[PDB]
């Protein structure tokens, strides 16, 4: 909206072109991560933790 | 499970989440009868329009609650005029005789 | 509409509508090619059948089924029945500001009182809390009021 | 906004045109790589409105400022997206067809108005036997079924003097041709 | 086996004999405990009384 | 003798409603008219076409266009384009050589200039004139036109047909419907005179006091007869032979149209045969049949019996084309272009054979290696093949919860997002209030807070009547002081939400 336009042009803060869709624990749940499994296609470089 | 506001379905425009915040409590026909029995017309009207389907109504009344004003500006539920469109698409001219 | 996996999800009417237009278009072509009237007759039969399956698949002697092989849902099937608009989305609706939970006895209660979990009441009364926090000044910002509530 | 009553009637074809914002001409839904509504298709943005708030398809007119305008490049109107939910289209049928609700109801309303057994209507509609819309000759009466070879014979004696047709064109001619005051008073 | 007969001769069986192992379908196997591992989830098919 | 069994059938049907049965009864009425029958039917067609050819041939000026537009297409110093592909192309019972065109057009124009001489000599249809017209027609008979221009020319003939008919209808209306003149005497007088108002005043000469009462429409009767004449002098071709040519072309067209019907109605069964190797692909059986039937109509149009080949081969080729092309044009919710459909089917076939060779479904690397195209397009096409799933499918096993009940509308605004942006609006209003009038106004018009549109620097410079960057300075100053913490604290907080 024009007002966000003014806000970002005053404090000089344009939002990044990358939105976050990170996986997070569902609300009301606690716990202890006991296992992580990473699956990658055959043809994509494996990141460090994989 | 609890819910103040969240996801809304696509066609009918009525409460239905589920991923984290689930869909709202269904207020079926029997409960509509119970409120009609009590004579509570305003609780019924808000449970039909501004709590469920009335889009302008639902957002306007969230704004009113945040302001500290508890009042309702109800319109017409989405499901009703979705029904009007679906009946009209059967080649049957149903309208609303305005004043 | 696109589902998560990249697949799409369509209301059956689209399929039904498609038939009509397809058949209608074929008819618009046959009348130009001056087809043998047996073929034009068959096309008109199928056009009538497609419109009928659109308006009411059941009432139509044979119900058109899609790739699922279960019958398509016509226009009349959406405003009709227990699952129709009337009985399911117009007399009884899903409702905001509503939760549910297991019940137990509060034998210390008075007749006009019900226990209510703190978490459930916090989630149900959330906009009221936002307005009150803004009013007290504890949160001059709705955005930070949400932060305080969380 | 407030209304008082709700009226149902029958939708005149002129009225169905009056509701519509444009004729649907193709069975195409959306594009397969761009996933954007195709012209004249079932989802066309010219007919049923724009896909995003205040944006034509080609992005020429792309802000609130240019609301109400029809982008000449793509024909879209710059308006809210909610009007994908309120605008209707219309298919111009290339041959009249029977409304099944008013024919296959238990008390057929077409069959009562005309007073023609539902079997005879189903035979005419399914393109199975003719029917006399109107005959100047006296031996043939209105609403009299003429099977195919019987039609051929009847054509042989007189020909133009009697009008017999097949299908929903015939039934529309029958419904259109009766006069309601006269049958009302005779009955 | 594909046997091809000649239609001129009465039963001229040896016009073509063609034997080849073919692959048709995969069939799930039962675990040692009466279950199937279908799509990673363990399923049971219950008997039917008809 | 098939309708005499259908009579009993329809009198004793089991209340049938299936269009398959109704069609299959009616396509079964007409019997297989093939082999000798087909050749006879094919001759009835070419005879109708040749009658139409001759009927065009007696009219000279249409041939003029033949040489006219050709001289048009040759007009641009070199051409072999669509228009030339549309001219004669005499089929001797490739690359176009214009020398042949000149060779075959020189004698045509020679006949043009030699036949007209005797048309005026001693009579319009003189014996020598008639013989030369017949020679012209015989020479023209071997010019088998390409269908597109041939249909254009028969259009140029039937337009004159219909304008003659419509002018006659208009005059018939204006005369009979108003003045109530008898058509019996009209027919004979019109055949007799056809050119002057001698018959008009002649029929009026018979006492008929009503025939006197035409003065108010006298200035219209012979004025419309003026146009009726002008038609004839424009054609320059007498009305009786116009009617003769009209009847010839009508009968010629009706012959061919009648002949093609037997071919189509006989090979309907062939259509049904090919259409049945195509079911379970999105289009219903009778949809595949009706596309086959259109393909069969094309095959009948393009069939040439002189080749000596069986008709079913050609028809099969066209019918399979129409069916398999429609099953690709339709039968998909999200239309896939035809060539992409073909590539998908290539992948399906190759996947089958690799599946049975290996014993595993091939990976896109091996599949790309086999099909000879990069893995990028392999994976693209694989993603394309998916068709929309149904919304009313039962994600609950009972008929309780369908898929469409779980589809969120992800376009709505989550209410508490800064109080549907109201809080930001209020806070901005407050902060701009603390600024001087000119700064506030220009700041608003620039970004647009509560303004009609977002006036650009140029526009706002126009508004305050300063054609310079004073506005830019002003905006810089304003933005500057609204970062100063003491001035903006509440506003700064929403940013880092």
C88 contacts C82 by C-beta, under 8 angstroms: yes
Put simply, the answer to whether A2 touches F454 (Cβ < 8 Å) is yes
Give span(s): CATH 1.10.601.10, chain F. 17-76+96-330
Put simply, the answer to whether F355 touches E23 (Cβ < 8 Å) is yes
Method: cryo-EM
Put simply, the answer to whether D6 touches B91 (Cβ < 8 Å) is no
Buried b (16+ CB within 10 A) or exposed e, F271-288: bbebbeebeeebbbbbbb
Scan for tokens 């933005």, then name that residue. F479
Tell me, in Å, the resolution of the deposited structure. 2.7
Region for F448 from its dihedrals, namely left if φ exceeds 0, alpha if ψ lies in -120 to 50, beta otherwise:
left
User: What is the CB-side half-sphere exposure of residue D17 using CA atoms within 13 A?
Assistant: 5
Put simply, the answer to whether F428 touches A6 (Cβ < 8 Å) is yes
D127 and chain B in contact, CB less than 8 A? no
C touches E, CB cut-off 8 Å, minimum 3 pairs: no
D145 bridge partner residues = D131
What crossing angle do the helices spanning F285-302 and C12-33 adopt, rounded to 10°?
A: 20
Instruction: Please measure the distance between the N-terminal and C-terminal CA atoms of chain C and give it in whole angstroms.
Output: 32
Contacts of F356 in chain E (CB under 8 A): 22-23
Structure tokens at D170: 């015939």
C57 contacts C77 by C-beta, under 8 angstroms: yes
Put simply, the answer to whether A7 touches F450 (Cβ < 8 Å) is no
Rounded CA gap, B15 and D82, in Å? 18
Nearest neighbour of C18 by CB, restricted to D27, D35, D95: D27
Closest-CA distance of chain B to residue F417, Å:
11
| CB < 8 Å from F in window 84-103 of D | none
**Nearest 5°: phi and psi at D30?**
-125, 170
Give span(s): CATH 1.10.10.10, chain F. 331-411, 412-493
User: Which residues of F are part of a known binding site?
Assistant: 489, 492
Q: Which CATH architecture has domain F17-76+96-330?
A: Orthogonal Bundle (1.10)
Rounded CA gap, F75 and F69, in Å? 9
Closest-CA distance of chain B to residue F425, Å:
13
Structure tokens at D13: 């074809």
C53 contacts D104 by C-beta, under 8 angstroms: no
Put simply, the answer to whether D10 touches B93 (Cβ < 8 Å) is yes
Put simply, the answer to whether B66 touches C1 (Cβ < 8 Å) is no
Nearest neighbour of C21 by CB, restricted to D91, D95, D125: D91
Contacts of C60 in chain D (CB under 8 A): 100, 104
Which site among C8, C97, C125 would you substitute to test the B interface, given the most B Cβ atoms closer than 10 Å to its Cβ?
Answer: C97
Put simply, the answer to whether C97 touches B24 (Cβ < 8 Å) is yes
Nearest neighbour of B25 by CB, restricted to C1, C79, C95: C95
Contacts of C15 in chain F (CB under 8 A): 333
| CB < 8 Å from B in window 48-107 of D | 86, 88, 99, 101
D81 and chain F in contact, CB less than 8 A? yes
Closest-CA distance of chain D to residue C1, Å:
10
Cα dist from D152 to B58, D14, D126, D146, whole Å: 68, 37, 19, 9
Residue closest to D178 by CA, chosen among D122, D96, D113, D103: D113
Neighbours of F83 (CB within 10 A): 15
A touches F, CB cut-off 8 Å, minimum 3 pairs: yes
Residue closest to A38 by CA, chosen among A49, A27, A26: A49
Nearest neighbour of C100 by CB, restricted to B25, B65, B82: B25
- Report the residue of chain F nearest D81, measured CA to CA: F411
User: Which residues of F are part of a known binding site for Mg(2+)?
Assistant: 489, 492
Running DSSP on this structure, what letter comes out for residue B50? I
- Report the residue of chain C nearest F29, measured CA to CA: C38
Angle at C76 between CA C72 and CA C82, to 5 degrees: 90
Put simply, the answer to whether B3 touches C119 (Cβ < 8 Å) is no
Rounded CA gap, F243 and F119, in Å? 19
Contacts of E22 in chain F (CB under 8 A): 356
B37 contacts B45 by C-beta, under 8 angstroms: no
Rounded CA gap, E34 and D17, in Å? 64
Rounded CA gap, F157 and F151, in Å? 10
B96 and chain F in contact, CB less than 8 A? no
**Nearest 5°: phi and psi at F390?**
-85, 145
Q: Using a CB cutoff of 8 Å and minimum separation of 24, what contacts does D112-120 make? A: D113/D175, D113/D178, D114/D143, D114/D171, D114/D174, D114/D175, D114/D178, D115/D143, D116/D143, D116/D174, D119/F15, D120/D145
Structure tokens at F15: 């209340």
Structure tokens at C53: 């399956």
Q: What SS3 class is residue D30?
A: strand
Put simply, the answer to whether C97 touches B51 (Cβ < 8 Å) is yes
Would you call F119 exposed, middle or buried from its count of C-beta atoms within 10 A (0-12, 13-18, 19+)?
A: middle
Rounded CA gap, F384 and D33, in Å? 8
Put simply, the answer to whether B96 touches D88 (Cβ < 8 Å) is no
Residue closest to F155 by CA, chosen among F236, F81, F59, F244: F59
**Nearest 5°: phi and psi at C39?**
-70, -40
Residue closest to F90 by CA, chosen among F108, F75, F109: F108
Residue closest to F415 by CA, chosen among C131, B39, E15: C131
Put simply, the answer to whether F422 touches B5 (Cβ < 8 Å) is no
Put simply, the answer to whether D148 touches F6 (Cβ < 8 Å) is yes
Q: How many CB pairs under 8 A join C and D?
A: 64
Q: Residue E43 belongs to what H/E stretch?
A: strand E41-43
CATH topology of domain F331-411: Arc Repressor Mutant, subunit A (1.10.10)
- Report the residue of chain D nearest C8, measured CA to CA: D35
Closest-CA distance of chain B to residue D6, Å:
5
Cα dist from A14 to A17, D82, F322, F492, whole Å: 9, 29, 56, 14
Residue closest to F48 by CA, chosen among F261, F289, F332: F261
Residue closest to B80 by CA, chosen among F474, C93, C148: C93
F10 contacts D147 by C-beta, under 8 angstroms: yes
Q: Using a CB cutoff of 8 Å and minimum separation of 24, what contacts does C100-105 make? A: C100/B1, C100/B25, C101/B1
Q: Residue B98 belongs to what H/E stretch?
A: strand B92-98
Closest-CA distance of chain F to residue B66, Å:
8
In this structure, chain D runs to a length of 187
Put simply, the answer to whether D126 touches F333 (Cβ < 8 Å) is no
Q: Using a CB cutoff of 8 Å and minimum separation of 24, what contacts does D177-184 make? A: D177/D133, D177/D134, D177/D142, D178/D113, D178/D114
In this structure, chain F runs to a length of 497
Nearest neighbour of C14 by CB, restricted to D29, D95, D104: D29
Put simply, the answer to whether C95 touches B10 (Cβ < 8 Å) is no
B67 and chain D in contact, CB less than 8 A? no
Rounded CA gap, F271 and F320, in Å? 9
Nearest neighbour of F494 by CB, restricted to C36, C41, C141: C141
In this structure, chain B runs to a length of 99
C59 and chain B in contact, CB less than 8 A? no
Rounded CA gap, C97 and B43, in Å? 13
- Report the residue of chain E nearest F354, measured CA to CA: E23
Domain F412-493 has CATH 1.10.10.10: yes
Closest-CA distance of chain D to residue C47, Å:
8
E4 bridge partner residues = E16
Going by their DSSP bridges, the two strands F389-390 and D162-165 should be labelled as unpaired
Sign of the torsion formed by the C-alpha atoms of D19, D23, D27 and D31: negative
Q: Give the distance between the most distant pair of CA atoms in chain D.
A: 73
| CB < 8 Å from F in window 79-138 of C | 83, 126-127, 130
Rounded CA gap, B70 and D120, in Å? 64
Put simply, the answer to whether F447 touches A11 (Cβ < 8 Å) is no
Nearest neighbour of D4 by CB, restricted to B75, B87, B99: B99
Going by their DSSP bridges, the two strands F389-390 and C9-10 should be labelled as parallel
Which site among B1, B2, B69 would you substitute to test the C interface, given the most C Cβ atoms closer than 10 Å to its Cβ?
Answer: B2
Q: How many CB pairs under 8 A join B and C?
A: 113
E touches B, CB cut-off 8 Å, minimum 3 pairs: no
């Amino acid at each position: 909206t024009p007002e966000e336009k003014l806000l970002r042009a005053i404090f000089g803060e344009k939002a990044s072109d990358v939105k976050d869709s990170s996986l997070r624990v569902p609300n009301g749940v606690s716990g202890t991560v006991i296992d992580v499994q990473v699956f990658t296609r055959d043809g994509v470089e494996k990141d460090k933790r994989a | 499970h609890a819910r103040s506001t969240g996801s809304y379905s696509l066609v009918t425009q009525q409460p239905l989440g589920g991923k984290a915040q689930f869909g709202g409590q269904r207020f079926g026909e029997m409960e509509v009868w119970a409120l009609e029995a009590y004579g509570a017309a305003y609780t019924l009207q808000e449970m039909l329009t501004v709590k469920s389907d009335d889009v302008n109504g639902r957002t306007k009344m969230y704004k009113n609650i945040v302001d500290g004003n508890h009042q309702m500006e109800p319109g017409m539920p989405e499901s009703f005029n979705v029904l009007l469109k679906e009946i009209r698409s059967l080649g049957i001219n149903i309208e609303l005789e305005d004043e | 509409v696109p589902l998560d996996g990249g697949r799409f999800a369509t209301s059956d009417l689209n399929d039904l509508y498609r038939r009509v237009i397809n058949r209608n278009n074929r008819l618009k072509r046959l009348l130009d090619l001056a087809a043998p009237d047996i073929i034009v007759r068959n096309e008109k039969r199928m056009l009538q059948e497609a419109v009928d399956a659109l308006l009411d698949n059941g009432r139509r002697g044979r119900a058109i089924t899609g790739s699922n092989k279960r019958p398509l849902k016509s226009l009349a099937d959406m405003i009709k029945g227990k699952q129709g608009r009337f009985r399911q989305n117009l007399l009884g609706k899903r409702v905001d500001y509503s939760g549910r939970s297991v019940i137990t006895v509060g034998p210390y209660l008075r007749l006009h009182q019900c226990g209510l979990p703190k978490k459930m009441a916090l989630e149900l009364f959330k906009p009221f809390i936002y307005g009150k926090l803004e009013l007290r000044g504890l949160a001059t910002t709705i955005k930070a009021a949400k932060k305080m509530v969380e | 906004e407030e209304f008082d009553a709700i009226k149902i009637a029958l939708a005149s074809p002129d009225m169905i045109r009056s509701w519509s914002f444009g004729e649907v001409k193709k069975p195409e839904t959306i594009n397969y790589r761009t996933f954007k509504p195709e012209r004249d298709g079932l989802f066309c943005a010219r007919i049923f409105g724009p896909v995003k708030d205040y944006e034509c398809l080609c992005g020429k007119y792309k802000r609130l400022k240019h609301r109400g305008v029809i982008c000449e490049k793509c024909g879209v109107e710059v308006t809210q997206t909610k009007v994908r939910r309120e605008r209707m289209g219309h298919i111009e049928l290339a041959s009249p067809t029977a409304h099944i609700w008013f024919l296959k109801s238990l008390p057929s309303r077409i069959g009562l108005l005309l007073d023609m057994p539902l079997r005879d209507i189903e035979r005419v509609l399914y393109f199975e036997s003719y029917v006399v819309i109107e005959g100047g000759m006296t031996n043939l009466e209105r609403q009299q079924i003429l099977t195919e070879e019987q039609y051929l014979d009847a054509l042989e004696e007189f020909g133009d003097e009697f009008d017999a047709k097949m299908g929903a064109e015939a039934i529309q001619a029958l419904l259109k041709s009766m006069d309601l005051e006269q049958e009302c008073e005779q009955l | 086996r594909l046997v091809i007969y000649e239609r001129e001769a009465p039963e001229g069986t040896v016009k073509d004999i063609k034997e080849q192992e073919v692959y048709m379908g995969e069939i799930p196997l039962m675990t040692d405990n009466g279950t199937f591992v279908i799509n990673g989830t363990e399923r049971v098919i219950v008997s039917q009384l008809h | 003798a098939a309708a005499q069994v259908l009579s009993s059938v329809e009198s004793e049907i089991g209340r049938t409603t299936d269009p398959v049965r109704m069609y299959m009864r009616e396509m079964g009425t007409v019997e297989l008219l093939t082999r000798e029958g087909e050749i006879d039917i094919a001759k009835r067609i070419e005879d109708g076409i040749n009658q139409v050819q001759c009927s065009v041939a007696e009219y000279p000026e249409a041939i003029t266009y033949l040489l006219e537009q050709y001289d048009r297409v040759e007009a641009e110093e070199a051409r072999l384009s669509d228009l030339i592909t549309g001219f004669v192309d005499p089929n001797a019972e490739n690359s176009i050589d214009p020398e042949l065109a000149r060779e075959k057009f020189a004698e045509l124009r020679a006949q043009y200039v030699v036949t007209r001489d005797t048309i005026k000599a001693k009579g319009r249809s003189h014996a020598t004139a008639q013989e030369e017209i017949l020679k012209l027609s015989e020479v023209f008979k071997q010019f088998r036109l390409v269908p597109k221009q041939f249909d254009y020319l028969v259009n140029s003939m039937r337009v004159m047909m219909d304008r003659v008919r419509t002018q006659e209808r208009l005059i018939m209306k204006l005369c009979v419907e108003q003045c109530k003149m008898p058509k019996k005497n009209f027919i004979t007088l019109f055949t007799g005179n056809e050119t002057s108002d001698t018959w008009f005043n002649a029929a009026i000469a018979m006492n008929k006091p009503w025939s006197e009462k035409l003065h108010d429409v006298s200035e219209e009767v012979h004025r419309a007869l003026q146009k009726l004449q002008q038609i004839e002098e424009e054609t320059g071709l007498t009305i009786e032979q116009v009617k003769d040519i009209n009847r010839r072309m009508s009968i010629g067209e009706a012959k061919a149209r009648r002949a093609k019907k037997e071919m189509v109605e006989a090979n309907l069964r062939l259509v049904i045969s090919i259409a049945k190797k195509y079911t379970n692909r999105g289009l219903q059986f009778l949809d595949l049949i009706q596309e086959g039937n259109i393909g069969l109509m094309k095959a009948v149009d393009k069939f040439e019996y002189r080749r000596g080949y069986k008709f079913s081969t050609y028809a099969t080729w066209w019918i399979r084309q129409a069916i398999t092309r429609s099953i690709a044009d339709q039968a998909r919710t999200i239309r896939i272009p035809v060539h992409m459909i073909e590539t998908i089917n290539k992948l399906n076939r190759i996947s089958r054979q690799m599946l049975q060779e290996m014993g595993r479904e091939p990976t896109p690397e091996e599949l790309a290696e086999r099909m000879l195209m990069p893995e990028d397009k392999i994976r693209k096409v694989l993603k394309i093949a998916k068709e929309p799933i149904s919304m009313e499918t039962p994600i609950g096993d009972d008929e309780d919860s369908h898929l469409g009940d779980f589809i969120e509308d992800t376009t709505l605004e989550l209410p508490l997002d800064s109080a549907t942006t109201e809080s930001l609006r209020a806070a901005t209003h407050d902060v701009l209030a603390g600024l001087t009038a000119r700064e506030a106004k220009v700041l608003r018009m620039r970004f647009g807070i509560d303004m009609n549109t977002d006036y650009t620097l140029e526009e706002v410079g126009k508004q305050f009547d300063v054609t310079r960057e004073r506005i830019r300075q002003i905006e810089a100053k304003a933005l500057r002081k609204l970062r100063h913490p003491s001035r903006s604290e509440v506003l700064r907080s929403f940013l880092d939400d």
